[PDB]
Amino acid sequence: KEIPRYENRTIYGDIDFRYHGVKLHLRSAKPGFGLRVNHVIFEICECAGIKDLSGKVYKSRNDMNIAKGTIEAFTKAQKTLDEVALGRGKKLVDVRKVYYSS
Amino acid sequence: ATLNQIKRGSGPPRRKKISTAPQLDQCPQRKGVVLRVMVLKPKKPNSAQRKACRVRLTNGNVVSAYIPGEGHDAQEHSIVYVRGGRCQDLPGVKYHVIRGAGDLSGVVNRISSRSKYGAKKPS
Amino acid sequence: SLVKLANTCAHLQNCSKVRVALTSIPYTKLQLQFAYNLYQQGFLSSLQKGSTMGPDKDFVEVTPDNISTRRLWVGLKYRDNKPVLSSCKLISKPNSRIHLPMEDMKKLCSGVTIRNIKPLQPGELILVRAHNNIMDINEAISKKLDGEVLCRVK
Amino acid sequence: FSRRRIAYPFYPFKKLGRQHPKKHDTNLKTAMRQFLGPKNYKGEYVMNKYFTVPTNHVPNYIKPDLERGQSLEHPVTKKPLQLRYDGTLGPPPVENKRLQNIFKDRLLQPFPSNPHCKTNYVLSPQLKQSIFEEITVEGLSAQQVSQKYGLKIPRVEAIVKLVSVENSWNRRNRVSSDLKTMDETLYRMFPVFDSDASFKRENLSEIPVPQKTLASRFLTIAESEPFGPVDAAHVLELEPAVETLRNLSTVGEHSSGHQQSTNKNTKVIYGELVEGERSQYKFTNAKVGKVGYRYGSGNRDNKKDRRIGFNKLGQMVYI
RNA sequence: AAUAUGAAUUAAUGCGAAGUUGAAAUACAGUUACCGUAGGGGAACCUGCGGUGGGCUUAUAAAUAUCUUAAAUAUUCUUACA
RNA sequence: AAAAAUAAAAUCCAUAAAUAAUUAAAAUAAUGAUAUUAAUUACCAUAUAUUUUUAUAUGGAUAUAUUUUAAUAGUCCUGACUAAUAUUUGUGCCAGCAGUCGCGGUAACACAAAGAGGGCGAGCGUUAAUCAUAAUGGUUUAAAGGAUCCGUAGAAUGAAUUAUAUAUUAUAAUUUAGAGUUAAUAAAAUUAAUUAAAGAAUUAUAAUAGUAAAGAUGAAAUAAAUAAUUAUAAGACUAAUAUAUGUGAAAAUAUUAAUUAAAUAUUAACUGACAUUGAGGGAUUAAAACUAGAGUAGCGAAACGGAUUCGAUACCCGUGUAGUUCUAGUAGUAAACUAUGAAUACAAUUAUUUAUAUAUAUAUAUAUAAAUAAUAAAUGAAAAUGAAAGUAUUCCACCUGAAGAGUACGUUAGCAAUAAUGAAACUCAAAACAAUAGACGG
RNA sequence: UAGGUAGUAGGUUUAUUAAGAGUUAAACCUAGCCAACGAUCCAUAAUCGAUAAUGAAAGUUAGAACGAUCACGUUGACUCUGAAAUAUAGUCAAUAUCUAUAAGAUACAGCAGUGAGGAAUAUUGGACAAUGAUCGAAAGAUUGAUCCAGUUACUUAUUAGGAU
Ligand SMILES: [K+]
Ligand SMILES: [K+]
Ligand SMILES: [K+]
Ligand SMILES: [K+]
Ligand SMILES: [K+]
Ligand SMILES: [K+]
Ligand SMILES: [K+]
Ligand SMILES: [K+]
Ligand SMILES: [K+]
Ligand SMILES: [K+]
Ligand SMILES: [K+]
Ligand SMILES: [K+]
Ligand SMILES: [K+]
Ligand SMILES: [K+]
Ligand SMILES: [K+]
Ligand SMILES: [Mg+2]
Ligand SMILES: [Mg+2]
Ligand SMILES: [Mg+2]
Ligand SMILES: [Mg+2]
Ligand SMILES: [Mg+2]
Ligand SMILES: [Mg+2]
Ligand SMILES: [Mg+2]
Ligand SMILES: [Mg+2]
Ligand SMILES: [Mg+2]
Ligand SMILES: [Mg+2]
Ligand SMILES: [Mg+2]
Ligand SMILES: [Mg+2]
Ligand SMILES: [Mg+2]
Ligand SMILES: [Mg+2]
Ligand SMILES: [Mg+2]
Ligand SMILES: [Mg+2]
Ligand SMILES: [Mg+2]
Ligand SMILES: [Mg+2]
Ligand SMILES: [Mg+2]
Ligand SMILES: [Mg+2]
Ligand SMILES: [Mg+2]
Ligand SMILES: [Mg+2]
Ligand SMILES: [Mg+2]
Ligand SMILES: [Mg+2]
Ligand SMILES: [Mg+2]
Ligand SMILES: [Mg+2]
Ligand SMILES: [Mg+2]
Ligand SMILES: [Mg+2]
Ligand SMILES: [Mg+2]
Ligand SMILES: [Mg+2]
Ligand SMILES: [Mg+2]
Ligand SMILES: [Mg+2]
Ligand SMILES: [Mg+2]
Ligand SMILES: [Mg+2]
Ligand SMILES: [Mg+2]
Ligand SMILES: [Mg+2]
Ligand SMILES: [Mg+2]
Ligand SMILES: [Mg+2]
Ligand SMILES: [Mg+2]
Ligand SMILES: [Mg+2]
Ligand SMILES: [Mg+2]
Ligand SMILES: [Mg+2]
Ligand SMILES: [Mg+2]
Ligand SMILES: [Mg+2]
Ligand SMILES: [Mg+2]
Ligand SMILES: [Mg+2]
Ligand SMILES: [Mg+2]
Ligand SMILES: [Mg+2]
């Protein structure tokens, strides 16, 4: 599956996702932050192309259910800026990106 | 719990390791006198003749200490130094005697891990 | 009433899950200001005054004779098989109200967790009440206002 | 799963066969002798393609992946030579196609496994003199010379400082033959800088990335509202990025805009000096509540982060 | 009077090995188990009274059916007829 | 691809120390404990040029050159967690190792060692300690909803509009959607307490004729009858309807009537937030039990007997005391269970009853609620929950590994049995739930 | 530890103090005051920081070292002087020791050091050169404050040989 990536490095905002007994709390990170997450989540992020991420797993830490929950979270719990803008009829500006633009 | 119940004391239990050497009184080690040397039988599924010793510490606490290493010269009235650490297969033996301290000599002919058995370096 | 606002936020979540195009909320000043902000921010398609039975087609003056039968009717938006208004939660709760100075509101919009409030996320709307007026947090920061952080909509 | 792994060559090599009992050799040692080739009576390895330095301004960086471990070539014709069954070196059966069309980037990449590390370009002895004569004699600004030759201002300022040292050394005959020989050898090992070549030119728009801005703030504004760099700067409470670039270009000692006078407002007194006194007192006006050593400050001497500095004489001193 | 110490004296309990007397529980466990309570018995346990299901929802037929043009007509039909 | 190993030696070049000269600074008017000062320089001094630095040349100084000159780390570990693949020897559930899981019974990667290897390093290990390492929690079934409701405090929470103020609060006025009051109209006959009645049967006694067995059980045996028809007495119980449907706070509540008390829906008018929840507290609370006085048919702990059995302090049978009943009290416990606290707002369907209302071409039809059943979504460890165990808000109770233990001690209460409150030590790395596939089932 | 309190809670007046007040003493009135958001009682503990440790952080821990505050100088009470002392003073008593045997002196929690206790913590060192403190008009005197050194891997840091 294709997963949305903000700047092809991280997720859009923060994610609090519940997959069966696994409570996933994932936070987006600044460029160069690296992957600071559960080891199962780390491997998935490497394959998916996520470079910067922070997170913590609560309740169940079953490897199998963390991996599936993570995949589900990356698809069902994210919304691109473009999708948010079109749905609300509003312009969303990345302030950090504009600051370094012409 | 509700917000008022938390205000009244409700909260997560704290996680902090508990003392497993209460008889030492929060000291690294305590001197003692061997009351009686004994041989004990491990709990199953282990089988051995584990050498232990009953010791009266300088604070009046009497404990059972495991004598590590192959062979020991500990007797009654021998001055021993006791440290923390239980013998897993021997129930009730929660302490260790230090080899090479007091009247307990270092393990004879010990080559590896000498510092753990009071053995000096061979020239 | 913050309780009424909590009821409305939960109601909108329930309606979004079933994908009803039109629903009603209690007729009060706070509810009207709350709905109006959502409408201007693009979370609601429509906002009409009405009765218990439906939105009014022609203007109906509200008086004590019919105040008990008044309702506000809001249209929910759905695009690409997803609800536009997915979640709606209070920050300031009835049993724990949160008043922040403008300095702390700027930290909240900058990624800093203030008083356990998770910071503003991309595309999220946080509303603040100041002197009985409801506005977006970014607008309160522009006006140098201190106010109660009411709710967050995403 | 992990285990100790002897670092055998990734490429194929001739392993040891049955060995006479007193050789006591290793497969690593024999693989190295195959990489090095024969050692002559002078202690040299003439058959190895890396023994001698390049003299054509093209670095000779190792390419084991492209040559599959074949590091031997004829010392004069530079023609590949490989080990044969006889134990002699001879032409390879098939030419290596991976070694004839090498990308330009790879030629400047010294380490096979890191393509983000590249060598820098050496400046010719002429461009340095031109830069030296323009900043010092013609009186051009470092910003002008930087924008002209495509060099970062700090590098421009460094060239002037170094050329001044080379004049004093040449004015006192301190540059010996060995130094001249070494300098020329090293000059012919690196790609020369070409101010005209656009790709060789250094980027001149780089600014340090602050930390407050490193976060990602997003604003929801009207669909047709214009939002530009200046508006973003106000949101982030920082000077515009273009202003930061301009202020960083006026830092060079020979650059335009260099100014330092707002600090000349601190009353100083130089005590009277009398015959026989070995030192002079200098008094600097300060303010109560700021001046002085604080009481009860953290002692770090017994901590890993103990502060260590260096005085004017270069001696290590505890701060 | 309190606190601490030792204490004649005396109560409860854990673990360890390890047999003994029975066979109480888990299946309808061979008398449904368990809860409260009372009495009795080497020991588990037995018995009375009410309660619970964490046991019986595990639940599955006394059967009986009808008339309009069977075709030179429906069944065929390929953008046609109208 | 089994290495040890560029490791060693050897070669080149250094610096430290030593030696020599020199010599700050802490302090100056002078005074230096530290002190055999730091640092610098390598024959010393001087001049010139000379970022630094370098270089030349000079005065004195030794025989064209100019003091000498190095480099011996320990400690833990290599089965997994946890970095350590090059193998080998001894031991044989012994000796011993062990933070956790565990290792050792003749091929031990774990014990004791050799080889090789991995950490940290003038330290390494170990013990004793501190911080961090999951509540961005839970209580039907795993620890955990209080038996139930009433209601006090709450420094708990809680409607609408407008105007002020010093502002999520206060005050004032105003409002009626929450919560109440009174009527009207319709509906229902239940739930408490009390009083007055009825019914089938049972046991006993007597009579009558009529007999010789009757009764019991798996089979048995223990203790003028049994059966039949009459008459009399006594206590307890309440067949069908019946679904505990419904009603009641829970416990409870179904033979009849009466008295008293409480309870439904809609409409009209009225009050104008008077509400929710509820620590402490209060009240009620099955069965058993206890204190008095009555009653005592049947049933029935115990006890004494009969059987069964290898035994039978049992299951079955007999005789059957307390108790079961009533009156007045004590006590406040149950698997007191929906193993699921109360309130409010809200979310997709169907079926079936019930209620109120509406209509008519009068018996259905159309509406709006309640209940129950099956579900969507959602939630969940799942089994499942389903208008909550969903989405939310408010308040209370409760839980924090097993065992020890709902025990010990103390205290309070009670006539008493007991009830409430309620630990710690020691020991262990367990312990528990849902579900899966089997095996087994008198 | 569930009831506690009896100058206890409040009022009035005098005494005392530079000064308020049941702060102490005296008199007379009122019946209060505290407490299940924990009184009273018991146990334990010097407190804290722009200090140290740890953590992403809220926090948690320590309270040696640096600094701030309090208390104490073998134990108890009292008095004198004084702006201020229940003073490391004085008085009396207690405990211990000592010699001069007196209504005596001493009390190392000042420095060094010793015995004891403990798993465990150092020299009976040098100097008043520096910074301070006391006395003196000054010259100067004194200073175990302080500055230095010694002992100890207790902590930190640098170095502990490079090319071939
Ligand atoms: K049984
Ligand atoms: K029972
Ligand atoms: K029973
Ligand atoms: K090593
Ligand atoms: K549950
Ligand atoms: K019922
Ligand atoms: K009002
Ligand atoms: K209330
Ligand atoms: K209560
Ligand atoms: K009876
Ligand atoms: K039940
Ligand atoms: K409750
Ligand atoms: K207390
Ligand atoms: K100390
Ligand atoms: K001095
Ligand atoms: Mg490994
Ligand atoms: Mg049996
Ligand atoms: Mg049985
Ligand atoms: Mg049974
Ligand atoms: Mg019995
Ligand atoms: Mg029973
Ligand atoms: Mg069963
Ligand atoms: Mg069942
Ligand atoms: Mg030297
Ligand atoms: Mg001097
Ligand atoms: Mg070992
Ligand atoms: Mg072997
Ligand atoms: Mg190991
Ligand atoms: Mg070993
Ligand atoms: Mg070895
Ligand atoms: Mg070190
Ligand atoms: Mg935490
Ligand atoms: Mg609950
Ligand atoms: Mg209940
Ligand atoms: Mg319960
Ligand atoms: Mg009403
Ligand atoms: Mg008869
Ligand atoms: Mg009946
Ligand atoms: Mg019912
Ligand atoms: Mg209540
Ligand atoms: Mg009686
Ligand atoms: Mg019987
Ligand atoms: Mg009662
Ligand atoms: Mg009980
Ligand atoms: Mg109970
Ligand atoms: Mg019941
Ligand atoms: Mg109610
Ligand atoms: Mg009890
Ligand atoms: Mg189960
Ligand atoms: Mg007074
Ligand atoms: Mg007083
Ligand atoms: Mg008085
Ligand atoms: Mg103390
Ligand atoms: Mg603290
Ligand atoms: Mg403290
Ligand atoms: Mg100290
Ligand atoms: Mg004192
Ligand atoms: Mg004193
Ligand atoms: Mg005194
Ligand atoms: Mg003393
Ligand atoms: Mg001393
Ligand atoms: Mg000692
Ligand atoms: Mg001295």
UniProtKB/Swiss-Prot annotation, chain A:
It is found in: Mitochondrion. It comes from the Eukaryota. Transmembrane segments: none annotated. Component of the mitochondrial ribosome (mitoribosome), a dedicated translation machinery responsible for the synthesis of mitochondrial genome-encoded proteins, including at least some of the essential transmembrane subunits of the mitochondrial respiratory chain. The mitoribosomes are attached to the mitochondrial inner membrane and translation products are cotranslationally integrated into the membrane. Component of the mitochondrial small ribosomal subunit (mt-SSU). Mature yeast 74S mitochondrial ribosomes consist of a small (37S) and a large (54S) subunit. The 37S small subunit contains a 15S ribosomal RNA (15S mt-rRNA) and 34 different proteins. The 54S large subunit contains a 21S rRNA (21S mt-rRNA) and 46 different proteins. uS3m, uS4m and uS5m form the narrow entry site of the mRNA channel. Present with 6680 molecules/cell in log phase SD medium. Belongs to the universal ribosomal protein uS5 family. This is Small ribosomal subunit protein uS5m. It comes from Saccharomyces cerevisiae (strain ATCC 204508 / S288c) (Baker's yeast). The chain holds residues 206 to 307 of 307 of the full protein.
From Swiss-Prot, chain B:
Keywords: Mitochondrion, Ribonucleoprotein, Ribosomal protein, Transit peptide. One of its GO terms (cellular component) is mitochondrial small ribosomal subunit. One of its GO terms (molecular function) is structural constituent of ribosome. It is found in: Mitochondrion. One of its GO terms (biological process) is translation. The keyword Calcium does not apply. Signal peptide: none annotated. Component of the mitochondrial small ribosomal subunit (mt-SSU). Mature yeast 74S mitochondrial ribosomes consist of a small (37S) and a large (54S) subunit. The 37S small subunit contains a 15S ribosomal RNA (15S mt-rRNA) and 34 different proteins. The 54S large subunit contains a 21S rRNA (21S mt-rRNA) and 46 different proteins. uS12m forms part of the decoding center of the mt-SSU. Present with 238 molecules/cell in log phase SD medium. Belongs to the universal ribosomal protein uS12 family. Component of the mitochondrial ribosome (mitoribosome), a dedicated translation machinery responsible for the synthesis of mitochondrial genome-encoded proteins, including at least some of the essential transmembrane subunits of the mitochondrial respiratory chain. The mitoribosomes are attached to the mitochondrial inner membrane and translation products are cotranslationally integrated into the membrane. uS12m is required for respiratory growth. This is Small ribosomal subunit protein uS12m. The gene is MRPS12. The chain holds residues 29 to 151 of 153 of the full protein.
Swiss-Prot record, chain C:
One of its GO terms (biological process) is mitochondrial translation. Disulfide bonds: none annotated. Signal peptide: none annotated. Pfam families: Ribosomal_S8. One of its GO terms (cellular component) is mitochondrial small ribosomal subunit. It is found in: Mitochondrion. GO terms for molecular function: structural constituent of ribosome. Keywords: Mitochondrion, Ribonucleoprotein, Ribosomal protein. InterPro entries: Ribosomal_uS8, Ribosomal_uS8_sf. Gene3D superfamilies: 3.30.1370.30, 3.30.1490.10. Belongs to the universal ribosomal protein uS8 family. Component of the mitochondrial ribosome (mitoribosome), a dedicated translation machinery responsible for the synthesis of mitochondrial genome-encoded proteins, including at least some of the essential transmembrane subunits of the mitochondrial respiratory chain. The mitoribosomes are attached to the mitochondrial inner membrane and translation products are cotranslationally integrated into the membrane. Component of the mitochondrial small ribosomal subunit (mt-SSU). Mature yeast 74S mitochondrial ribosomes consist of a small (37S) and a large (54S) subunit. The 37S small subunit contains a 15S ribosomal RNA (15S mt-rRNA) and 34 different proteins. The 54S large subunit contains a 21S rRNA (21S mt-rRNA) and 46 different proteins. This is Small ribosomal subunit protein uS8m. The gene is MRPS8.
From Swiss-Prot, chain D:
GO terms for cellular component: mitochondrial inner membrane; mitochondrial small ribosomal subunit; mitochondrion. Belongs to the mitochondrion-specific ribosomal protein mS45 family. GO terms for biological process: mitochondrial translation. Component of the mitochondrial ribosome (mitoribosome), a dedicated translation machinery responsible for the synthesis of mitochondrial genome-encoded proteins, including at least some of the essential transmembrane subunits of the mitochondrial respiratory chain. The mitoribosomes are attached to the mitochondrial inner membrane and translation products are cotranslationally integrated into the membrane. Component of the mitochondrial small ribosomal subunit (mt-SSU). Mature yeast 74S mitochondrial ribosomes consist of a small (37S) and a large (54S) subunit. The 37S small subunit contains a 15S ribosomal RNA (15S mt-rRNA) and 34 different proteins. The 54S large subunit contains a 21S rRNA (21S mt-rRNA) and 46 different proteins. This is Small ribosomal subunit protein mS45. It comes from the Eukaryota. It is found in: Mitochondrion. Present with 3460 molecules/cell in log phase SD medium. GO terms for molecular function: structural constituent of ribosome. It holds the Pfam family Bot1p. InterPro entries: Ribosomal_mS45 (IPR021036). Keywords: Mitochondrion, Ribonucleoprotein, Ribosomal protein, Transit peptide. It comes from Saccharomyces cerevisiae (strain ATCC 204508 / S288c) (Baker's yeast).
